[PDB]
Amino acid sequence: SPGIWQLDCTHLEGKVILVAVHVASGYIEAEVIPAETGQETAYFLLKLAGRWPVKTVHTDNGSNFTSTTVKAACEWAGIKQEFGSNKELKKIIGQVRDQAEHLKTAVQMAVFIHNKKRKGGIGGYSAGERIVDIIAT
Amino acid sequence: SPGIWQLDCTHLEGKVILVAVHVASGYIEAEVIPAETGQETAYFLLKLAGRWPVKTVHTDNGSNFTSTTVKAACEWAGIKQEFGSNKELKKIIGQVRDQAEHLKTAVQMAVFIHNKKRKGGIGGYSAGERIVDIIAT
Numbered sequence: 048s049p050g051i052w053q054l055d056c057t058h059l060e061g062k063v064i065l066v067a068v069h070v071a072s073g074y075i076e077a078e079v080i081p082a083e084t085g086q087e088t089a090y091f092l093l094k095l096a097g098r099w100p101v102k103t104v105h106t107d108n109g110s111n112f113t114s115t116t117v118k119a120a121c122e123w124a125g126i127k128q129e130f131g132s133n134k135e136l137k138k139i140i141g142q143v144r145d146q147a148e149h150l151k152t153a154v155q156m157a158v159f160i161h162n163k164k165r166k167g168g169i170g171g172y173s174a175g176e177r178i179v180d181i182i183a184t
Numbered sequence: 185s186p187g188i189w190q191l192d193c194t195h196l197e198g199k200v201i202l203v204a205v206h207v208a209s210g211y212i213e214a215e216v217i218p219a220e221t222g223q224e225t226a227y228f229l230l231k232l233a234g235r236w237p238v239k240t241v242h243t244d245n246g247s248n249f250t251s252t253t254v255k256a257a258c259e260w261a262g263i264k265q266e267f268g269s270n271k272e273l274k275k276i277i278g279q280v281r282d283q284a285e286h287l288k289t290a291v292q293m294a295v296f297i298h299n300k301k302r303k304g305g306i307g308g309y310s311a312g313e314r315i316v317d318i319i320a321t
């Protein structure tokens with residue numbers, strides 16, 4: 048559906064990367080949070096939903112179900128939190144890592160290349176075009 | 185054009201709000217930066233360009249032309265920086281300000297409502313639909 052996302056956390060250089068995947072497009076947004084805090088996750092979701100239709104977020108564990116601020120964010124923005132690979136991100140992060148002082152910069156460079164690039168280098172739509180194409184329809 | 189943005193800074197409770205406007209849609213993204221630093225502006229632009237086609241950014245003063253990191257961001261992402269109202273944002277910020285501890289949260293609530301809402305309350309497209317509609321074409 049046009050509003051279905053997947054939310055997962057990954058780890059690099061002792062910091063936390065929050066990753067949202069639009070499941071139908073493979074479009075990603077990500078942020079480095081100082082710790083695995085609710086506030087930061089609530090803030091990330093509010094930003095995401097102001098930008099894209101975000102109707103249902105799927106997570107794989109209990110963490111997001113125990114944050115009072117994530118719950119208030121879900122309600123304010125009208126996001127259903129439901130219970131129940133894309134770390135080629137980390138390969139791209141290694142390719143750029145030394146073009147950037149900060150990890151957060153290298154993550155955003157990785158997200159930029161993930162979203163802009165064509166599948167297998169050539170022809171048809173990038174993840175960033177697919178999400179616009181899906182939402183346009 | 186589909187890739188034309190406007191970048192301006194505004195101020196509230198002694199902090200800096202970075203605002204990008206997609207000129208053809210009125211779609212906005214914004215962030216509270218600790219100070220009016222280049223790094224923060226470079227980071228904001230890199231994030232923006234990974235999400236939308238960003239071809240030309242117009243600013244009204246010299247500040248962005250004297251940051252080495254904004255310059256490296258422009259080059260990395262392929263953004264032309266060119267020299268040469270939407271603070272109904274601040275009215276919406278006042279309406280939500282007390283639904284949020286942090287200013288950054290109230291800004292994102294304001295951006296969410298700016299982008300989601302219909303012009304004069306009823307009918308035809310929001311700023312968020314317009315930018316997708318323009319980029320789809």
Ligand SMILES: Cc1ccc2oc(C#Cc3cccc(C(=O)O)c3)c(CC(=O)O)c2c1
Nearest residue numbers: 086087089090093119120123284285286289
């Ligand atoms: C209803 C709703 C929706 C979204 C939200 O995001 C936040 C937050 C946050 C945040 C992010 C990074 C750093 C820090 C810091 O203090 O260092 C805070 C809130 C909490 C509030 O503002 O009431 C919130 C609430």
Ligand SMILES: Cc1ccc2oc(C#Cc3cccc(C(=O)O)c3)c(CC(=O)O)c2c1
Nearest residue numbers: 147148149152223224226227230256257260
């Ligand atoms: C080529 C290019 C493109 C985009 C970029 O963004 C940054 C940055 C930053 C930033 C934001 C918030 C907080 C802080 C902090 O240290 O407290 C830093 C850079 C600098 C680097 O990473 O080399 C950069 C470079």
